[model samples]
Target: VIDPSELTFVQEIGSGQFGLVHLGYWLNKDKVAIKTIREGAMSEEDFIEEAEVMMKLSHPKLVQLYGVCLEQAPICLVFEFMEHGCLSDYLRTQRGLFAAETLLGMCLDVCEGMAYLEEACVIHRDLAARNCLVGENQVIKVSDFGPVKWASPEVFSFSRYSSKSDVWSFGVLMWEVFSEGKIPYENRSNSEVVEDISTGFRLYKPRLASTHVYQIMNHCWKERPEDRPAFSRLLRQLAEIAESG
Candidate 1:
């Protein structure tokens, strides 16, 4: 329940496939990230429909959707300010600055958020490191994005998105975290990736990930959606790993 009048844009901090993200003040008081979804991303009506669902989603590890402003052409979505920005860029900039255990914590946070989404019976069609936000105190929260390289076979082929496919994305995200934000299949093209993944290719284990952790990633990468681990199970496994470290 926010109006365009209540929003004040400070500056454009970032931009994505959808639109620009601004570092702004809500009512000149609270700092917030105001993202504008440009025209053609979706119709105004469609955006509003999606926003309605997003408004009801609340989880510590999921970026909070404060409100939406629909009075203008480019729809705006106000979100909780993430201090450090996207996880992928953060991982790249901070490479060699954190331990594997710390990276695991980030993955744990994302899994916790995904688990909540699973509980709520929602499918995050787009889940990747770039979509996750990093805030102060090393807090990591999942947002959303669809990097084709992160897509599962079913997602790439049939356009089917379920919790299991989301799990596939999570595995690629884990690889990104451990590889210090390296994009998956750096040398492959999108079409090639479709072919490779369909033909049984998967991203290799990251150096920073132990066999145990990589095993979880492998579990998520299983060819059949039914073979993928649920977010609840992944949550417990990650908790165990975190405990071990």
Candidate 2:
């Protein structure tokens, strides 16, 4: 078993409905981030669901799960520390500072990560700028798998959570990236946004977003799930945009 005592939590890095994350270090050596699940908030089945998904996913563009601690009651997941924090934070600070090339690169990274998830038959149901981390090397790593869904064995058999639903979430992520951290459906409640989306209302296009990027977001937010492009195709299009920008 990994020694939990080896690490000491320093400060809270972030928090969401599932739990809180802490900036931590181990034995004065390796830097780490620890996520502690909220006590009595998740059932054993839910915990296993998330843990199993994380264990099965392995990619440089996705957060690495070093280990987990369950003896503490609430359970904790250890991850490689991302010094620069979440993409939302960085984009907020540097709003309109990045050139088109840089923005394209960031978006391309997100597409690559999403492609990997789709290839592995995992769906990140809650893709957003807040769930993307910026590492020390300026690489983007997609995080937060608590809302993920696993595909069934039978072809075309949808999981309880639809993979195309994730494409809708990805559209919001794309808007956040292009707007330099503006929250999608800002100044609106969840119910309001849900109503708007249900009624076929989409977020107004940002003036600064490139036409190609806008088209990508449009495709992702199509009313019909099957109308959305697969991540593989999305990756190729984004790659071309990045190279040409």
Candidate 3:
């Protein structure tokens, strides 16, 4: 049981449908990230769903769920504070500083997290650069699973998907990293992105990405979900690439 009195919101960091995340202080000392869902923002059932997922997840490449405050006006979730904030924002603001190796490291980080979840029969339906976060040492942690949607798909259309669908989004997340945080399919409307994905029309290789790396991205977008290499395979391949640099 977490004590509400011990948690204090120090500053607003981000917001979503559930509520807001704040740079928080615990026991007036320990630094943490507090995610608040106001009284009316969600049902107790919805809150439990998110909390349960976090409670069950434990991995170095994933955000740690420290605790939660349920007996209060605004239920709150406590997470390890990510020093560099969200990955998308970090990639955008610090454009030219990223090396190919550094970018590969980030991709491997997400792959590691996703691989863990895949092994456990979990799927992070909302996988994206925006859903990842950067901590000290530029480590990227997969966060924000409150809005997950379970699904499956063949090659192009997924009615229900597992981690393979996440593989597709991971390709786009890689695109975000290589392109200095450009919105995926920024030149096209939302409808176009859906159409393009169905047509296997992936974004052009980012100028920063080498042919070898971009080829992996293409492999991720294979029209058949089964054709997309598993996260375990991706982790091995990306780790080898990072080591080669």
Instruction: Report the lDDT of model 3 for residue 244.
Output: 77
Please provide, for model 1 over 58-101, each residue's C-alpha lDDT reduced to its tens digit, 9 standing for 90 to 100: 88999887788887756888987999999999999989897998
Full candidate order by lDDT, most accurate first: 1, 3, 2
Candidate 3 Cα RMSD (Å)? 2.7
User: Mind giving the per-residue lDDT tens digits that candidate 3 earns over 105-215?
Assistant: 888899999889888778887788888999979999999863121112352343566778888778878888888788766666654556666665667899888887898
Q: Where is the poorest 10-residue window by lDDT in model 1?
A: 143-152
Candidate 2 displacement at residue 242 in angstroms: 1.5
Tell me the lDDT of model 2 at 81.
Answer: 92
Error of 2 at 159 (Å): 11
TM-score of each: 0.93, 0.86, 0.92
Model 2 residue 177 lDDT score = 79
Looking at model 2, residue 119 earns an lDDT score of 83
Which stretches of candidate 3 lie above 4 Å from their native place? Answer: 146-158
Q: What is the C-alpha lDDT of each candidate?
A: 0.88, 0.75, 0.80
Locate the minimum summed-lDDT window of 10 residues in model 3.
147-156
Candidate 1 vs 3: which has more lDDT: 1
Error of 2 at 240 (Å): 1.2
Q: Model 2: per-residue lDDT, tens digit, 1-245? A: 34456778899988875689888887788789988889777776787678877888888788887777766655778888988999989989988787767766787787788888988888786788888999956688898864211111111234345566666677777778778888777777754565666677777777667888888888887767788888888889888777774
- Top candidate by TM-score: 1
